[PDB]
Amino acid sequence: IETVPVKLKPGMDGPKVKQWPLTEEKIKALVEICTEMEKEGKISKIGPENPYNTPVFAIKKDSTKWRKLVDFRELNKRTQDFPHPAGLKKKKSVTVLDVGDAYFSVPLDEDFRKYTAFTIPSINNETPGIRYQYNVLPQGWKGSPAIFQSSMTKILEPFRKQNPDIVIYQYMDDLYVGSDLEIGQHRTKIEELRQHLLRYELHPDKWTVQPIVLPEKDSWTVNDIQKLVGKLNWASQIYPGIKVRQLSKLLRGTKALTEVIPLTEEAELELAENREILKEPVHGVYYDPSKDLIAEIQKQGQGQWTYQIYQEPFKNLKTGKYARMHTNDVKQLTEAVQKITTESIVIWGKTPKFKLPIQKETWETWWTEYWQATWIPEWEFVNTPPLVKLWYQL
Amino acid sequence: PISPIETVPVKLKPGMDGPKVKQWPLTEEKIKALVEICTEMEKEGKISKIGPENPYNTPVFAIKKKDSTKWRKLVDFRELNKRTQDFWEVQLGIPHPAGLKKKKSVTVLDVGDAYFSVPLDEDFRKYTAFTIPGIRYQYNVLPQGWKGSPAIFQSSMTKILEPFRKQNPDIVIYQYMDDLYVGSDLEIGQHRTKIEELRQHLLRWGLTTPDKKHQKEPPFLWMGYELHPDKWTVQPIVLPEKDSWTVNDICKLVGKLNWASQIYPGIKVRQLSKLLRALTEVIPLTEEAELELAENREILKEPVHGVYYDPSKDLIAEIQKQGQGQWTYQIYQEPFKNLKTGKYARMRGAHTNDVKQLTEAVQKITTESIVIWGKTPKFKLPIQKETWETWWTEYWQATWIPEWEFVNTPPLVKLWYQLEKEPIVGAETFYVDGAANRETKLGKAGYVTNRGRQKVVTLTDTTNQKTELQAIYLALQDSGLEVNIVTDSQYALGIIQAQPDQSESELVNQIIEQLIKKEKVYLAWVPAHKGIGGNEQVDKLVSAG
DNA sequence: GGGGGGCGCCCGAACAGGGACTG
DNA sequence: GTCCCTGTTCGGGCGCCC
Ligand SMILES: Nc1ccn([C@H]2C[C@H](O)[C@@H](COP(=O)(O)OP(=O)(O)OP(=O)(O)O)O2)c(=O)n1
Ligand SMILES: [Mg+2]
């Protein structure tokens, strides 16, 4: 087992991200996990002469078993670049397996190890941080699926041969396994595969697209119509084909907001055609892998979240709704982000970049307390115009 | 003695070479201090005489330690530091006595001449060349003034204690540079045995622990505190009293106060900080400032201590509102027995309100409890459950406060007004708008109402966004206690809908006052320039420029 | 006096990004 | 495009510790 040379993109240095503070539970786990990882030569201690760093934390999946998670998002951004089944988004049942432990068997190019440095904090800073670095393929680095792809093919080959109707997709530490089996059939197949690999659960078709939908009411006020004309004027951008002139003609004069306005039969019908121009599928939007998926999320209230995935403005690839319930917005929002990412990995095998409707600090204070994925999407924080959140309302 | 620890491999940043800098002149008292230090270090192989093989040089001086007596040799490696590689600092923060658990037996140890006990990489010794005015030396150990030295010592120190720690998992050793706090649950004699094991472990690795810096009895002096067996205290904080404060003087007073606020409840520095908006510049105190300064001065006069941490109990944090974006908090487990205290006062956002700020405070404290005790505390907040509920409904953002309980202790945090969700029947409807000329900076704000009232106000040295905020202000100014306002300004609608009670903006403040006075307000938005009446009529009125 | 690393606090400077505007 | 305004980060003082 000799190593594959790996480069950083040209004109790019390795990551230098400060570790954030961890809870006692998480540190206790990381220290225990790292000890064992060091015993098995999988990681080595390093000093401060290594100038690179990358955060670590840990998630507890009802278990007694923690999972180390290294936030390699910078390193991935900085690593020299390296199979997508359209049939995976159709399976009645898709299961997600953690094949991250597979990478610890392949060593890692000695000249690259320095960029995988991470640091473990101590409670109350009783000690300096303890710095490690990887000697094998790290979980969460985008290099590890690449290097191991060759081996990964050899392993699933007979399982794919024997089950040519089952589709197996790999993204990072993850193995997506989709079948058209009644549940139990599929389950017994999943444990057939995992037992086969020592030697819960998804349903991609019951996924929903959330249309833009217009109010239906029998008497309209000036306020009603003004909100309506505002909603359509913006949807004009997404769907060319939506018209406001006839409705906007009812707002002639300077009327009181609560005045009721009889709908002229022109405007009554124009409002009808628009309704259908919303249900008609959006036109002219081709998934480009050379540009990243942007995802916007909007808080609709009462545990309702809307989202849109697009690569260019108003050119949506998908638009959805995520519904929940001591309600916790941060918990719900990260559950949404994991839900949207998963759907995105399934459909286009690329992770989206989230525009998050939350204060940066609030998000960084709590998101890891509800993270359950082995990957971490990139994200940025936005103060969303309270207009957009009404556009997608149900 | 020099540690037999492996040196840490260090290099210069590429394409650069070591420092060549004239040795500035020194006091005679300092030269005797330095030759005293150098002649000794040189006999111990800590420094080595060099020749003309070594082109480099870097200035040296010496300051007195805390001790009254001994000198600390230093080296202005500012230049070599520019040219040395990057290190990853491993010291992630500062241990806090409030995070210490109660121990049956405690010891504080300091290492003798710590840096000079850790060897420096051979290939790098050249660049540490210096001159005592007159002999020329280089360092074989870590110099004090190099930027590599702290991370290297800390890491080296950590390696050295790793064996002792694994062998003695239940002896706790807080490790700050060379300072060690060692705690055990052992009877005094079994502890003293363990300490002697430690000191000899250190000695084997070349780090001595002189009995002079070996504390055996309470109260222990540690990290700037006195540690008693049941309580801890900060070593006295003495504020200046210069009755003609300068920007430097202020900064030292703000600094001592923030440091003080960790255990002193009620410290405020808003009015002091406000003052400093170069360092020799004298500034006149404001009334608000000196009134504050005196309040703090009265606070510091009182006697106060902290307690240690019992992990069997809860962490409770209660927050007091201090006014003008200021907040104090007290973290405790048993009532009136503080673990520590603190202040939040950061102004962030041109416009904000007290619930945002409370949420920011909760966040800071959460992060800080997580560092210190490794867990989140339970909160006691001066905000009614209904107030928060309203805000978490009204707000278009994800926002959250962890487990918490209300506390009747005023000033209670409130929402100072609530925009209506639906338009108000029997309320004059204002269509406002503003336009401003980019070139001339002249502009107009004004409105048109469903009752036939129209008004335009001309403005000078204004901007588009300003004219839209002005139009809304104008409508609030001329409306009853109940008003429907229709704006096309996404900007203005976004600010006001966030329900601020404070602003950097005088104008938004004037607006906030109006919104608080009103009894029902409703803000609707419409798209601009689309013939929408009567946004249309007010647009023509206002756009004559 | 003057050097270093860490954390903290405040401030102001750059720069990033969305919206409104000129024709 | 430009200008405006808002948010972030980063670097500079100071505090404290070694
Ligand atoms: N102003 C200071 C204080 C300390 N240090 C560093 C180098 C010191 O060796 C180490 C520990 O500081 P001490 O005050 O304990 O000093 P020493 O250990 O060198 O000396 P002593 O024998 O007096 O303890 O931290 C520094 O660079 N600058
Ligand atoms: Mg010492």
Author numbering:
A (entry chain B): 5 to 65, 67 to 87, 95 to 211, 232 to 357, 361 to 429
B (entry chain A): 1 to 133, 141 to 284, 288 to 555
Question: What wording appears in the published article?
Answer:
NRTIs mimic natural deoxynucleosides or deoxynucleotides and target the reverse transcriptase (RT) enzyme. RT incorporates active metabolites of NRTIs into the growing DNA chain which act as chain terminators due to their lack of 3ʹ-OH. M184 is part of the conserved active site YMDD motif found in several viral polymerases, including HIV-1 RT and HBV polymerase. Herein, using the same DNA construct, we report the pre-steady-state kinetic analysis with WT RT and M184V to determine the incorporation efficiency of both (+)- and (−)-enantiomers of FTC-TP and 3TC-TP compared to dCTP in addition to crystal structures of WT RT in complex with dsDNA (RT–DNA) bound to either, (−)-FTC-TP, (−)-3TC-TP, (+)-FTC-TP, or dCTP.
In order to compare how the cytosine based NRTIs bind in relation to the natural substrate, the structure of the ternary complex of RT, DNA and dCTP (RT–DNA•dCTP) was determined. The triphosphates interact with a Mg2+ ion with octahedral coordination, as well as R72, K65, and K220. To further help position the phosphates, dCTP forms an intermolecular hydrogen bond (2.8 Å) between its 3ʹ-OH and an oxygen atom from the β-phosphate, thus stabilizing the triphosphate conformation. Comparing the central ring, it is striking that the C1ʹ and C4ʹ have nearly perfect alignment between (−)-FTC-TP and dCTP. For RT–DNA•dCTP, Cγ is positioned closer to the ribose ring. Remarkably, the γC of M184 in the RT–DNA•dCTP structure mimics the branched carbon of valine, suggesting that it has some role in stabilizing dCTP binding. Comparing the position of Cγ in RT–DNA•(−)-FTC-TP to RT–DNA•dCTP, the atom moves 1.8 Å.
